[PDB]
Amino acid sequence: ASPFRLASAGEISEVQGILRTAGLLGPEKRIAYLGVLDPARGAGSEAEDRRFRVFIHDVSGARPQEVTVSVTNGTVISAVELDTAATGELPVLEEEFEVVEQLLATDERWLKALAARNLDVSKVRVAPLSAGVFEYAEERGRRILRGLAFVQDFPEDSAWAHPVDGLVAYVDVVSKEVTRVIDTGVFPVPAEHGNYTDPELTGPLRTTQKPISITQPEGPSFTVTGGNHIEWEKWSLDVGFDVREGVVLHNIAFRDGDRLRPIINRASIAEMVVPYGDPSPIRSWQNYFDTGEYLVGQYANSLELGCDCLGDITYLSPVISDAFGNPREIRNGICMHEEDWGILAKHSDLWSGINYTRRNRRMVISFFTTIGNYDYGFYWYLYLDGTIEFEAKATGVVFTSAFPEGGSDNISQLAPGLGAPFHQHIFSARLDMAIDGFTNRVEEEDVVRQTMGPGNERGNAFSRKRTVLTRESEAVREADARTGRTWIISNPESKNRLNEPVGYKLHAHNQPTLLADPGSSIARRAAFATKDLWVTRYADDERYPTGDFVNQHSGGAGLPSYIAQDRDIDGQDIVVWHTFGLTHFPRVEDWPIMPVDTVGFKLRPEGFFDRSPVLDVPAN
Amino acid sequence: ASPFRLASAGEISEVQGILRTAGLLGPEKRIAYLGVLDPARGAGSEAEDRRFRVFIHDVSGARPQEVTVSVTNGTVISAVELDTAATGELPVLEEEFEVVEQLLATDERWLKALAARNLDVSKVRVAPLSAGVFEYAEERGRRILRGLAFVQDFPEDSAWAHPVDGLVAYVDVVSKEVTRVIDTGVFPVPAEHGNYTDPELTGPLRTTQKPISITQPEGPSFTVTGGNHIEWEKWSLDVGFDVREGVVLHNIAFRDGDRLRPIINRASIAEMVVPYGDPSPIRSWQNYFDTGEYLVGQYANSLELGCDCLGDITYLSPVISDAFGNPREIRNGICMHEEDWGILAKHSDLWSGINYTRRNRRMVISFFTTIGNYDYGFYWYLYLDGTIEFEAKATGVVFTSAFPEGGSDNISQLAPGLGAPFHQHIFSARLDMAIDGFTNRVEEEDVVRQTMGPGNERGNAFSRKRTVLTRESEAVREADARTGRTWIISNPESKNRLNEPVGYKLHAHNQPTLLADPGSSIARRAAFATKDLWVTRYADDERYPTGDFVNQHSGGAGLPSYIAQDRDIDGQDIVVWHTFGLTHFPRVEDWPIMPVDTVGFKLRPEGFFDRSPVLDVPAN
Ligand SMILES: [Cu+2]
Ligand SMILES: [Cu+2]
């Protein structure tokens, strides 16, 4: 019955059917994006209308369409031709990824470049990379991918060990033409292999790890109903999945006594970008919007038991559309389990004689995706004490280059002749807040130091201040770790028993934001990434901090355009957009396969509850 | 055989015997501190000399002594009378904690204060609190504790719910006299109870938690030999214990191929302070040095199985001295176990067809201590990938006050009439570095932004810079989260296969440091807490950032005096002292018992290894 249920195979084949019947999905058409729309505000009263949004590409060069379909009613709600030079190209299609290599393999300029380096074309892999927007006027309105080359010595070789520097090509994937081949000069192709399953490199595998067995003999403490509704230790939510955003949480609420108290209406990673900091023209255009350009959901791994996810695991297998509108299941694409999280609370009291210890736990909802060389785990955590956390785990193989003779200010050395260009991985979490309902506001809280003097004669006092962000023009905020800056989302109309507005405090990690010059193409396309915290007034069409169409799309859309509306956010339906990232100067230890590194954020109750919400947790 | 073995009961009784035989431990003497000394530098060549350091208090008012004993040789190495007005009072004795309440109970000023509030003296608990150094000239050279009152309605009541504000007393615990009773006026004593095991407050306990069972059917992957030598997954260390510092790690090294490579010679929490930010004269003197004044090791909890520590646990039961020099075991005072830590590394490669996943693990070494209302867990973690981490878990019951009518800039409200003064918990980790041996140096690393222009035409470049800290005068550093500031400890004489000095990078959390005015008593006594990172040249007598005697000791000793020596730290035997803390504005959710909050730091290999050190970890 839930309007937040996952898309079923049936619904996708029905969208396919409706589009076909309507003349919108002939044999030259391809689905570049398809997802279910969230129900409108206040729609609980009305009967279900399951609506799907679809971006349709045309392989014959006709203009693509944005289409909204009602699968409940079997109708097309709206269909509009896109002008991609204006609003952006559609997301990269899975089927286009082979096309860069295939076209380049019979291009005389490419072949000349490979022959200058004595490289067998049959062994040269070409990464199909998003193009961005730079100085090339001919690319505007065209679907372009850029290709960087990596040699693969044999079928099972890791090509990433053998970058071909000094060489880049640009390809029109629709007309199937190579527009440019740039050769700046030969660099040595690093020779050492990076095959992390080859016994010659690993040495003898360790025999010293004894098993760890995690079991739940009575099964898990959470329930799943309606396919994707979770109830666990007072928490209630719906686990959604979208091909762009991946796992999306809906209706996060906490049962406090008899009352189901909303906290967050929708939580997602609404964008992620990987900007590169190497000024070589071979890579200075590289910025991968894994979410917006590639669609991280669509590359979600099938997660194997006792391996990717350990313990008593419950899986969801979300269904997505292939390029023709046929349903495709991602088997075991979402893991759900609970795990012990050490001590929750502890006190041994001298005066009472009472010793008290209680254990913490968290609910984990995750998926893992692979985008070329990169693999990312996305983890959401709900804790007994009302804390909500996100963590991204970054691993895979580092993107490589040659290491220049005489070194580099922008590239580190991994192996002899092998470089790793500096880069960042920067996420935007979109938190459609609903602290005890939709009437919310945000305050910025700083620690306040006090001067020794009258009222503070020992010079020990310290305090804090809160500033309400009243309108969107005042709601673009930066971190200040030194002053302990956080942001509190409260409901000014819902008060706890001490007559204070209930709230939640967002604790950031205060990692560096986007480093690029503010006049760069990336600073404009990823404007969101230049500031730690944005607050907008909710609107149904403000979904992504980069807009709907990121691929080859200049600035114009996304957060900077949303906030220009300068709308009231003081006790209104609001959305918090938190930027957070990792700044990576690759180390030798990252090669040949990267150990996980992490980044994230959390929100903790701040006068939301009338006392600790975990007094009723049992011993042992 | 190891000179780093834990103290045995035998050794302590022998210290007792040697002191007695030497005339230093008659019936008026009391041991305020006793611990084993680390072996001297280069002492591996010589035979063992187990030496113990002892601070001896005298209950008849004679001057205390600092004594060093050789238990191997049965001799007193040195004994010196302390002048406590100059160098500091000895640590608070366990036996003095009852004395504040007991003396106050027959003092006419105290009784008058309690009668003004209609409080039965038999129900008034008095916390025995360190005094610090303020404006009271009569306290210099005297052992003083200050008392704050809390009402306990019945034997099992939590007194913390019922603070008696407006009232403080000062007591000389040697002469057994009350020096001062200050009554600033009556405040309502908060009436609501805070009994977190009372069913009326907890409600019916949850029945929704199903078991989680963690077992190791082949036992743990680590070995313990010589009582306290750990070997686990290439790591090697000795787990020490000291009554002041608690758990201390020695000789942290990693077996890389056939070579045992030192990383850290000694790691400890060398101080921790809890400064309060309420300017009321009732509490404006409150700063608890839990390590330096109280000795956190001595209050280590006995940890119960499946409860404080879950899984397959190996315990150490360290032995300490009681006040008379008799050994006392802290049964199950140290937990050691390994645990799964999610994904270590993962890549699914399109070109090779190879899917690869490996799991992480960490070795955990911990203890938990209780100091009045506070309980802290100290956790050290060693990871497969060479990462070393510390985490402090703060819980217990918040220190309370009245909540003033009309509110407060320095106190939050927890319950009706019940306040919680703002405060910090600030730790100093002392890391006696030995990166591939003792010849080490520290660089401060910042991210460097670059301007769009020649050499960077797309404005995408970014870089980093490193500054060597060459002498102690340049080695007092602050955090800069915005520039991604870290500190690298390297060995300039030990190079990896890429000809770069091997190293480790310290990643701080960049939480606020000490907030107090720089002219305060606490800023001087806890000078270490005003800066994030200090580097000193190693000396055997520079143990604590606050000096040896913190109790009622002004500035004069500790880090600021150490660095004045302005010694060479550029390729020398050095010590890093990292300040890190929590700034706590208590929330309603912290009451009546606080859910755990955390703070910490970590160090990760930075070109230490020639490639990933976890290539030899097996699948599944
Ligand atoms: Cu990276
Ligand atoms: Cu606290």
Ligand code: NA
């Ligand atoms: Na909202």
Ligand code: NA
């Ligand atoms: Na050292």
